[PDB]
Design a binder for this molecule. Structure first.
Ligand SMILES: CCCCCCCCCCCCCCCCCC(=O)OC[C@H](COP(=O)([O-])OCC(O)COP(=O)([O-])OC[C@@H](COC(=O)CCCCCCCCCCCCCCCCC)OC(=O)CCCCCCCCCCCCCCCCC)OC(=O)CCCCCCCCCCCCCCCCC
Ligand SMILES: CCCCCCCCCCCCCCCCCC(=O)OC[C@H](COP(=O)([O-])OCC(O)COP(=O)([O-])OC[C@@H](COC(=O)CCCCCCCCCCCCCCCCC)OC(=O)CCCCCCCCCCCCCCCCC)OC(=O)CCCCCCCCCCCCCCCCC
Ligand code: HEA
Ligand code: HEA
Ligand SMILES: CCCCC/C=C/C/C=C/C/C=C/C/C=C\CCCC(=O)O[C@H](COC(=O)CCCCCCCCCCCCCCCCC)COP(=O)(O)OCCN
Ligand SMILES: CCCCCC/C=C/CCCCCCCCCC(=O)O[C@H](COC(=O)CCCCCCCCCCCCCCC)COP(=O)(O)OC[C@@H](O)CO
Ligand SMILES: CCCCCC/C=C\CCCCCCCCCC(=O)O[C@H](COC(=O)CCCCCCCCCCCCCCC)COP(=O)(O)OC[C@@H](O)CO
Ligand SMILES: CCCCCCCCCCO[C@@H]1O[C@H](CO)[C@@H](O[C@H]2O[C@H](CO)[C@@H](O)[C@H](O)[C@H]2O)[C@H](O)[C@H]1O
Ligand SMILES: CCCCCCCCCCO[C@@H]1O[C@H](CO)[C@@H](O[C@H]2O[C@H](CO)[C@@H](O)[C@H](O)[C@H]2O)[C@H](O)[C@H]1O
Ligand SMILES: CCCCCCCCCCO[C@@H]1O[C@H](CO)[C@@H](O[C@H]2O[C@H](CO)[C@@H](O)[C@H](O)[C@H]2O)[C@H](O)[C@H]1O
Ligand SMILES: CCCCCCCCCCO[C@@H]1O[C@H](CO)[C@@H](O[C@H]2O[C@H](CO)[C@@H](O)[C@H](O)[C@H]2O)[C@H](O)[C@H]1O
Ligand SMILES: C[C@H](CCC(=O)O)[C@H]1CC[C@H]2[C@@H]3[C@H](O)C[C@@H]4C[C@H](O)CC[C@]4(C)[C@H]3C[C@H](O)[C@]12C
Ligand code: CUA
Ligand SMILES: [Ca+2]
Ligand SMILES: [Zn+2]
Lengths: 44, 40, 513, 72, 258, 227, 75, 56, 91
């Protein structure tokens, strides 16, 4: 296995803009989920 | 703590982009749901 | 290689990393739920138009913050990363069982989000009291999916407790006694003993609730000779230990952070800190019925629970005064981590003191099931746990990643979060004293001003969370690689570099007698 | 030693089991089932069971386990 | 390495075990609510496959590969003791439910214990036999342990066979009791406490018996040395735990509760 | 009832609520002082260039840190437990009233002499009479005599509820199959409001309690009219 | 008679057994006074006390169960 | 029976780079593929069941 | 009544290496705590390593809760930065 900074994580930090996309999807999916669950319950 | 100079420095403009995209990723989806609550 | 490393791990650091990522995601879910609560309470009248949905949001908020954010971060994340490093051990005792404690959490979380998506959700409160949680008042799968979520979370933490206790007892250097282990390691050992003893009683209680709902048992049903109050005893026999589980690793991290940024080699009064944590752990098992002062128990029982509860202030005060005495005479470094820790000592003290107010059953009659309780635990638990996590995260981020944070950004983040949580929760004391019930979707008009201010504070804390994500991005974006860190002579976890190699202490430390 | 624990196994433990087996097998005959009374604290049905017709317990014995409406 | 600890090969069984837990729980949900046993049978299958392969791998690592140094064995001893403690506290919750209900019987019961309309089992009949059976099995498993330590293959196998036989006898007696019992799980809190507490105990007897059978086959295959046999010790500790829980059930539910 | 921008407890309507106010004032002074001392000491530890980084002896100071808090806890517990045992002392009630919780309303039973009973439902916002209070009014108030010791018995016909009236110091859970007792004594006539205080499902926010406290002669006339 | 007085047998917040005991006592007494054609005025104290303390739905359920033969208490 | 532990020690100590769960040979691969296929397929089925149960 | 293997006959891998080294009074797998010398420059604590540096923890005085950690490098003896005790690496 690869060792050292940027190499001990399950995501790539090779490109800061690809990283920004992955972090946005990651944290944004978590933050969005409850809003969509409330919408799902209201739409019943 | 001491550190090496940044391998890939993030300029003020680059920080403004990162911060803006970060904020929008939180705000836009929740905003869409809260704006359409009436429609539910 | 990716699947072998990240799905099939037997490595304490990688499993710690998975726990931190899991907990950070959960924290976003828990924060979104908290903002929906405060959007409803931000104005009188109804926003959601569905008070069952409000109740489901409050219930999910609690489960996510406790079981999926705090415990995974403190015990799974910081515990797995730091414990082996701080005792020079090559891994955990049971490195493969460790991976199963991790992988039980995503399915546990999936069961919780299934509960909220089927029927009308579990609008029970995180206590899940029958008969509201029973098969008449909550017909359908939602409560069963909540019970199963807790069974998987319970097994994850019980096996993790066995792993930490065994690791800490068995895998120190042969010269190192228990009285030469760092306070963070003590804090995890004691948390693990509380988990080992408390979670099985919760498991018994929620299993009874499952059988009452599905197999026609009547443990909690007076028609069969059962008693709703039996459920409360079993729940809170776990639940009081649980609140000490949530704070103890935080106490450990605070002791290391205060010592480090005071420029000290050691915390003030080490053996008193060990004594205090063991005392808190023990007393934590004999106080649970202070969650039940309004259910109709006997006066002498209420007198006993009031007195036993107040005793916890003594060992707790020793820790607070010991943190202050560690600052005393320090060459203070005003790092962002130090700011989090100072914020912790103050906000934890405020919440602990409102706990002593609530311990008095007489006053608790009027404060029980009001916003005074909500104010108490968001100071001691929500701010205490969160501020200890944020202090630990910014302190140890360079160890885990190999990269430095921007210290100015991190200070900005602290300042916003300090304003937000105080604006959110301080006014809830007034709401509680003036008699606003908790678990309410709407409130008499008199309560409007403090609910409005509290909801405005919740948005300030949102701004801090969003900024935190940006700050983590900027550190990985810029790639400032760590060169030196001070005080490695009294912080062994740093001595293998940043980040440490996959395998550390292949050759163990040398410690003579 | 092993010799002592074998001596306890064959000289105390299994003879005890033999005597309790004899005791049990002497009182093994069927007791006369009690009149059915539809007591509300018994034969609880808050949700149908997830098997059979939903009204029979998992190890239902027709001779001694009445339904809510009585003996089959 | 120049330490004595075990760096375990990367393994799929934690993930298969975690997924087996998802399938068993979602499976129970789909059985209780959506009238279907499919997910539950997949989950039970994958759980049994996971436990088989995980514990097979531990035997490979210890008997076949030599990874269980004294330090590793000391760890496993702590692990098994802590696991047993967690199981004791799980039972404690059921005893608490039992004593809560029986010490303060509500008006719905007739204000008495046993409740009106409950005809308890005679504790001097099969329940006393069950007691003699599990106590006898504690004596035979101690004979097995001493035979192994003394290097006696034949007598270890005979003693362990007798222990397993008594475990099976207890299970068949309890199954018969269950069928003959004139009260059910639906007979209020009496039936609830009786069947859930004795039912979880019967599950632990089946688990303990299965563990002893694994030890029997390992002994047949000469896995155990006269000095190194932690799987046997763990199964013995677990078995003594099962006995002690029975003695508490017998005194509490069958005898004091009659 | 609470009023806008309220910081503390609703004014005391019963002697035991008075006692709780005085007890809270005592305990809050202590909370304030300890909070303030910790903040002050943080600021004192942080505001000097002077250093002492060598090992410090903890034994002497830990005596102060355990004895002084022990004394403070005793100074809280003494008055605390005095009030607890006062709100237990034997009294001769002259009236017993039952309340049963339901999803989502209260019923009241006055069965000392006649079988008087009625339901008490929240007045919907759309039906409030001008000047009436949102979420707090009911159709049928709990009429009670003032300046008299009343036994309230509390239970439920479904899930848990909790019967609360903050200005009287009252909160008693409503548990099916259980009859919980509390004592009520109003020093004053008037209307006294409370709200369901155990989460009981979707309409937990919407099943209030309104007591109507009147002189005995008026209570008797009301009882007699009910016939 | 105004209301049920303090009873030292039932001194705590949980009054369930006070209600139950007085209902039993009234019905045991009533059955004793009818079983010699005696006089049920003798049973009046128990009647007033259970009527004062017991929820109407409890009294009504117990009455129905006595009539059905399913009352689990001994009368 | 005969003591064949030495022969199993030789098999499980062979320098072939296999992880312990696959080191017994082709049967280990088959049992692993069955287990993982049932877990992943079962998990996909549980998500479909969630989708179904999420609506009336 | 025999037929049970002994550790001598059947122990393998690291278990056997530990078993054989203990027979010879050797501790290659660091199971035992080493006994301190006087720790002077003339009598330094001798720290075995398979490589050119090893982490030392120094418990400077009996019952100290604070352990002092540092890398000991091959070459001239180094001193504990708290108590000045000498340590010498012996690959
Ligand atoms: C309710 C459910 C509960 C869910 C909870 C979820 C949250 C917990 C997450 C726990 C962590 C999961 C990690 C497991 C392994 C990752 C598997 C995966 O999908 O890989 C893609 C992805 C990596 O993407 P990449 O950059 O292309 O990496 C390429 C590899 O380096 C090069 O390797 P490669 O080329 O061989 O493989 C790359 C390739 C293919 O790789 C493979 O072959 C692997 C395939 C199997 C992986 C399956 C993973 C299952 C995980 C389930 C949840 C747990 O992957 C992809 O590009 C596509 C995969 C995308 C799958 C989506 C999974 C994302 C996470 C879940 C998000 C939540 C969604 C829920 C929606 C809610 C709706 C209501 O891994 C991640 O999931 C990483 C997380 C995302 C980045 C976040 C960064 C945040 C930083 C903040 C720091 C705070 C902590 C500090 C850490 C300390 C410093 C040391
Ligand atoms: C940065 C983030 C910003 C924070 C968020 C915004 C907070 C809102 C500010 C509140 C201002 C309220 C106001 O208009 O005060 C005027 C108010 C006018 O006085 P008043 O109407 O005559 O009140 C006299 C009452 O009879 C006094 O008796 P009472 O029974 O009516 O009042 C009792 C009540 C109200 O107590 C108060 O009077 C205010 C509390 C003091 C805050 C510190 O106090 C509580 O029980 C609050 C519970 C707090 C738990 C412990 C908190 C520890 C404090 C940490 C100390 C650190 C040292 C600095 O002035 C004040 O006394 C300050 C409040
Ligand atoms: C740890 C526990 C915890 C945490 C953190 C929080 C956080 C918050 N809580 Fe709450 N809350 C509870 C536990 C918690 N809560 C519980 C147990 C209940 C009772 C439920 C019941 O009644 O049944 C409750 C109930 C509760 C209520 C009462 C609802 C009612 O009675 O109707 C309210 C009201 O405002 C509230 C608000 C908030 C807000 C605004 C936040 C936050 O927005 C405050 C700011 C904190 C954050 C934003 C978190 C930041 C952390 C991360 C994002 C993790 C980052 C990770 C890494 C760095 C690795 N919560
Ligand atoms: C981090 C989690 C955490 C911690 C550590 C605590 C700590 C304490 N808690 Fe709190 N508590 C909760 C989380 C926590 N609590 C939660 C989640 C609930 C609600 C559950 C629910 O209903 O959802 C709750 C509810 C709860 C109740 C029930 C109230 C009710 O529902 O009516 C009570 C009652 O006594 C209680 C008291 C205490 C006490 C006395 C402490 C003590 O341990 C505090 C001791 C600390 C100090 C006192 C401060 C430092 C000391 C000094 C500076 C020394 C000097 C002090 C004195 C002399 C007083 N808390
Ligand atoms: C012979 C000795 C031992 C036998 C073991 C039991 C055999 C069948 C099931 C096995 C699992 C048992 C464990 C305990 C669970 C509940 C009930 C078990 C006790 C039992 O078997 O009770 C039976 C009922 O079973 C029932 O309802 C249905 C039982 C089947 C459904 C149970 C599903 C519930 C599963 C709960 C999961 C919780 C897991 C806990 C995890 C915690 C981790 C922290 C009794 O039969 P009856 O006809 O009512 O009366 C007899 C009348 N002649
Ligand atoms: C039809 C059947 C239905 C029931 C199914 C449910 C489950 C049944 C499972 C029964 C448990 C079987 C456990 C087998 C363990 C085999 C591996 C073993 O025993 O491994 C041993 C290590 O012990 C170790 O890991 C110790 C491992 C300890 C395992 C403890 C297991 C208890 C499991 C309980 C399950 C949870 C129950 C909770 C229910 C609510 C290996 O070391 P040694 O023995 O020293 O050998 C080495 C020498 O040869 C060298 O000379
Ligand atoms: C309603 C249904 C919901 C239930 C969901 C069930 C949950 C999960 C599915 C369970 C799948 C289990 C699969 C087998 C796990 C075996 C773990 C084991 O045996 O772990 C051992 C350690 O724990 C030890 O000993 C001592 C501990 C052994 C524990 C065995 C597993 C118990 C699982 C359930 C018990 C919960 C407790 C009941 C009380 C609440 C071995 O540790 P490893 O790191 O592997 O190896 C270390 C190497 O040196 C060995 O050579
Ligand atoms: C709890 C935390 C949440 C805090 C609140 C977040 C702050 C608001 C973020 C902006 O969100 C957006 O707001 C737009 C409105 O300004 C919406 O456009 C909506 O309105 C527009 C103009 O009215 C239309 O053009 C669009 O079609 C329509 O969707 C859009 O959907 C939504 O993404
Ligand atoms: C390669 C992997 C292959 C995976 C195949 C999965 C194995 C099971 C497939 C069939 O699924 C079943 O279908 C039955 C109906 O056709 C269900 O009847 C169930 O529902 C009945 C309703 O009549 C009840 O009697 C019982 O609960 C029960 O038989 C049964 O529960 C369910 O499992
Ligand atoms: C509550 C916040 C601050 C509490 C501070 C308590 C610290 C007590 C310091 C004790 O340390 C001592 O200080 C003395 C020199 O002054 C030394 O001579 C002595 O050897 C040393 O042990
Ligand atoms: C290798 C990975 C494993 C993949 C898993 C394979 C999934 C198998 C799909 C079969 O789906 C089944 O369909 C049955 C018939 O459509 C359902 O029967 C049940 O539902 C019926 C509905 O008509 C009822 O008659 C009964 O309850 C019962 O037979 C049952 O719920 C469901 O499971
Ligand atoms: C012949 C064989 C030898 C085993 C061996 O040394 O390889 C013997 C030794 C001990 C025997 C076992 C023990 O005597 C206990 C059991 C006795 C029963 O009568 C048959 C099965 C039973 C389980 C036996 C099977 C088999 O005959 C065993 C296994
Ligand atoms: Cu009724 Cu809340
Ligand atoms: Ca609103
Ligand atoms: Zn030294």
């Amino acid at each position: 296995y690869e060792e050292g900074p940027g190499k001990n994580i399950p995501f790539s930090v090779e490109n800061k803009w690809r990283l920004l996309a992955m972090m946005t999807l990651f944290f944004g999916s978590g933050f969005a989920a409850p809003f969509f669950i409330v919408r799902h319950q209201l739409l019943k | 703590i001491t550190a090496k100079p940044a391998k890939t420095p993030t300029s003020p403009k680059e920080q403004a982009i990162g911060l803006s995209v970060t904020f929008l990723s939180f705000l836009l989806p929740a905003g869409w749901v809260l704006y359409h609550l009436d429609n539910y | 290689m990716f699947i072998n490393r990240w799905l099939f791990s037997t490595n304490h650091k990688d499993i710690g990393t998975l726990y931190l990522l899991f907990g950070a995601w959960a924290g976003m879910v828990g924060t979104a739920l908290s903002l929906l609560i405060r959007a409803e309470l931000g104005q009188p009248g109804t926003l959601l138009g569905d008070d069952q949905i409000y109740n489901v949001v409050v219930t999910a908020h609690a489960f996510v913050m406790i079981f999926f954010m705090v415990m995974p971060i403190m015990i799974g994340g910081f515990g797995n990363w730091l414990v082996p490093l701080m005792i020079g051990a090559p891994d955990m005792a049971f490195p493969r069982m460790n991976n199963m404690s991790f992988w039980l959490l995503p399915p546990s979380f999936l069961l919780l989000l299934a509960s909220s998506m089927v029927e009308a959700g579990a609008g029970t409160g995180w206590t899940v009291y029958p008969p509201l949680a029973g098969n008449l008042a909550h017909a359908g799968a939602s409560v069963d999916l909540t019970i199963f979520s807790l069974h998987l979370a319970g097994v994850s933490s019980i096996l993790g407790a066995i792993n930490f206790i065994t690791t800490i007892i068995n895998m120190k250097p042969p010269a190192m006694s228990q009285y030469q282990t760092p306070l963070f390691v003590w804090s995890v050992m004691i948390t693990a003993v509380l988990l080992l003893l408390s979670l099985p009683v919760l498991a018994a209680g929620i299993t009874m609730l499952l059988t009452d709902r599905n197999l026609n048992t009547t443990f909690f049903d007076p028609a069969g000779g059962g008693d709703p109050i039996l459920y409360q005893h079993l729940f809170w026999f776990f639940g009081h230990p649980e609140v000490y589980i949530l704070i103890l690793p935080g106490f450990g991290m605070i002791s290391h952070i205060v010592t480090y940024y005071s420029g000290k080699k050691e915390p003030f009064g080490y053996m008193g800190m060990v004594w205090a944590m063991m005392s808190i752990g023990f007393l934590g098992f004999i106080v649970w019925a202070h969650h039940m002062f309004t259910v109709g128990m006997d006066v002498d029982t209420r007198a006993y629970f009031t007195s036993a509860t107040m005793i916890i202030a003594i060992p707790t005060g020793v820790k607070v005064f010991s943190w202050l005495a560690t600052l005393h005479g320090g060459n203070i470094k005003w790092s962002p981590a130090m700011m989090w820790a100072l914020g912790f000592i103050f906000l934890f003290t405020v919440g602990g003191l409102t706990g002593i107010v609530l311990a008095n059953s007489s006053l608790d009659i009027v404060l029980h099931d009001t916003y005074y309780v909500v104010a108490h635990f968001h100071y001691v638990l929500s701010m205490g746990a969160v501020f200890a996590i944020m202090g630990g995260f910014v302190h140890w981020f360079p160890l885990f990643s190999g990269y430095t944070l921007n210290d100015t950004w991190a200070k900005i983040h602290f300042a916003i979060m300090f304003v937000g949580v105080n604006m959110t929760f301080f006014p809830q004391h007034f709401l509680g004293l003036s008699g606003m019930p908790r678990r309410y979707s709407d409130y008499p008009d008199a309560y409007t001003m403090w609910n409005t201010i509290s909801s405005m504070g919740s948005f300030i804390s949102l701004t801090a969370v969003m900024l935190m994500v940006f700050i983590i991005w900027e550190a990985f974006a810029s790639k400032r690689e760590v060169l030196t860190v001070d005080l490695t002579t009294t912080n062994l976890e740093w001595l293998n570099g940043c980040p440490p190699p996959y395998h550390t202490f292949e050759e163990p430390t040398y410690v003579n007698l | 030693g092993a010799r002592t624990w074998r001596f306890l196994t064959f000289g105390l433990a299994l003879p005890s089991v033999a005597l309790c087996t004899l005791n049990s097998w002497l009182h093994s005959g069927h007791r006369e089932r009690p009149a059915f009374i539809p007591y509300h604290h018994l034969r609880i049905r808050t949700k149908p069971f997830s098997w059979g017709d939903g009204n029979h317990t998992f190890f239902h014995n027709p001779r001694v386990n009445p339904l809510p409406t009585g003996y089959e | 390495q120049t330490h004595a600890y075990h760096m375990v090969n990367p393994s799929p069984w934690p993930l298969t075990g975690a997924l087996s837990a998802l399938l068993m729980t979602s499976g129970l949900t789909m059985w209780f609510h959506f009238n279907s046993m499919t997910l539950l049978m997949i989950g039970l299958t994958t759980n049994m496959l996971t436990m088989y392969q995980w514990w097979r791998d531990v035997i490979r690592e210890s008997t076949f590969q030599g990874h269980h140094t004294p330090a590793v064995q000391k760890g496993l001893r702590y692990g098994m003791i802590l696991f047993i403690i967690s199981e004791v506290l799980f039972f404690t919750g059921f005893f608490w439910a039992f004593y809560h209900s029986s010490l303060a019987p509500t008006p719905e019961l007739g204000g008495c214990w046993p409740p009106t309309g409950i005809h308890p089992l005679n504790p001097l009949e099969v329940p006393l036999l069950n007691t003699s059976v599990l106590l006898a099995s504690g004596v035979s498993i101690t004979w097995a342990h001493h035979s192994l330590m003394e290097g006696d293959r034949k007598h270890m196998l005979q003693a362990l066979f007798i222990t397993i036989t008594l475990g099976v006898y207890f299970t068949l007696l309890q199954a018969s009791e269950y069928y003959e019992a004139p009260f059910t799980i639906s007979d209020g809190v009496y039936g609830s406490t009786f069947f859930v507490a004795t039912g979880f105990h019967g599950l632990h007897v089946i688990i303990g018996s299965t563990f002893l059978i694994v030890c029997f086959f390992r002994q047949l295959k000469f896995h155990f040395t006269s000095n190194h046999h932690f799987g046997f010790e763990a199964a013995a500790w677990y078995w003594h735990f099962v006995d002690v829980v029975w003695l508490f059930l017998y005194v509490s539910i069958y005898w004091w509760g009659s | 009832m609470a009023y806008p921008m309220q910081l503390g407890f609703q004014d005391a309507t019963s002697p035991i609520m008075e006692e709780l106010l005085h007890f809270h004032d005592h305990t809050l002074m202590i909370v304030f002082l300890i909070s303030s001392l910790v903040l002050y000491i943080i600021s004192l530890m942080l505001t000097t260039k002077l250093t002492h980084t060598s090992t410090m002896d903890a034994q002497e100071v830990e005596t102060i840190w355990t004895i002084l808090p022990a004394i403070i806890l005793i100074l809280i517990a003494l008055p605390s437990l005095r009030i607890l045992y006062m709100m237990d002392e034997i009294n001769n009630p002259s009236l017993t009233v039952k309340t049963m919780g339901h999803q989502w309303y209260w019923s009241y039973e006055y069965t000392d002499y006649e079988d008087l009973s009625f339901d008490s439902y929240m007045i919907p916002t759309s039906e409030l009479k001008p000047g009436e209070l949102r979420l707090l009014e009911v159709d049928n108030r709990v009429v009670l005599p003032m300046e008299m010791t009343i036994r309230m018995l509390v239970s439920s016909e479904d899930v848990l509820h909790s019967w609360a009236v903050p200005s009287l110091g009252l909160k008693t859970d409503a548990i099916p199959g259980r009859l919980n007792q509390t004592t009520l004594m109003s020093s004053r006539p008037g209307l006294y409001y409370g709200q369901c205080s155990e989460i009981c499902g979707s309409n937990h926010s919407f099943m209030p309690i309104v007591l109507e406290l009147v002189p005995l002669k008026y209570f008797e006339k009301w009882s007699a009219s009910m016939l | 008679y105004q209301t049920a007085p303090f009873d030292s047998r039932f001194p705590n917040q949980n009054q369930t057994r006070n209600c139950w005991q007085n209902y039993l006592d009234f019905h045991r007494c009533e059955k004793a006074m009818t079983a010699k054609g005696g006089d049920v005025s003798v049973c009046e104290w128990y009647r007033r006390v259970y009527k004062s303390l017991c929820p109407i739905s409890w009294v009504s359920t117990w009455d129905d169960r006595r009539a059905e033969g399913t009352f689990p208490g001994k009368i | 029976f005969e003591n064949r532990v030495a022969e199993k020690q030789k098999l499980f100590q062979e320098d072939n780079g296999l992880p312990v769960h696959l080191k017994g040979g082709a049967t280990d691969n088959i049992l692993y593929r069955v287990t993982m296929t049932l877990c992943l397929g079962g998990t996909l089925y549980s998500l479909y069941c969630l989708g179904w149960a999420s609506f009336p | 009544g025999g037929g049970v293997p002994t550790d001598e006959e059947q122990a393998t891998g690291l278990e056997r290496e530990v078993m054989l080294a203990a027979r010879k009074g050797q501790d290659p797998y660091n199971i035992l705590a080493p006994k301190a010398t006087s720790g002077t420059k003339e009598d330094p604590n001798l720290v075995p390593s398979i490589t050119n540096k090893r982490i030392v923890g120094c418990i400077c005085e009996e019952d100290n809760s604070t352990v002092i950690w540092f890398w000991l490098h091959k070459g001239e003896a180094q001193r504990c930065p708290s108590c000045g005790t000498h340590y010498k690496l012996v690959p």
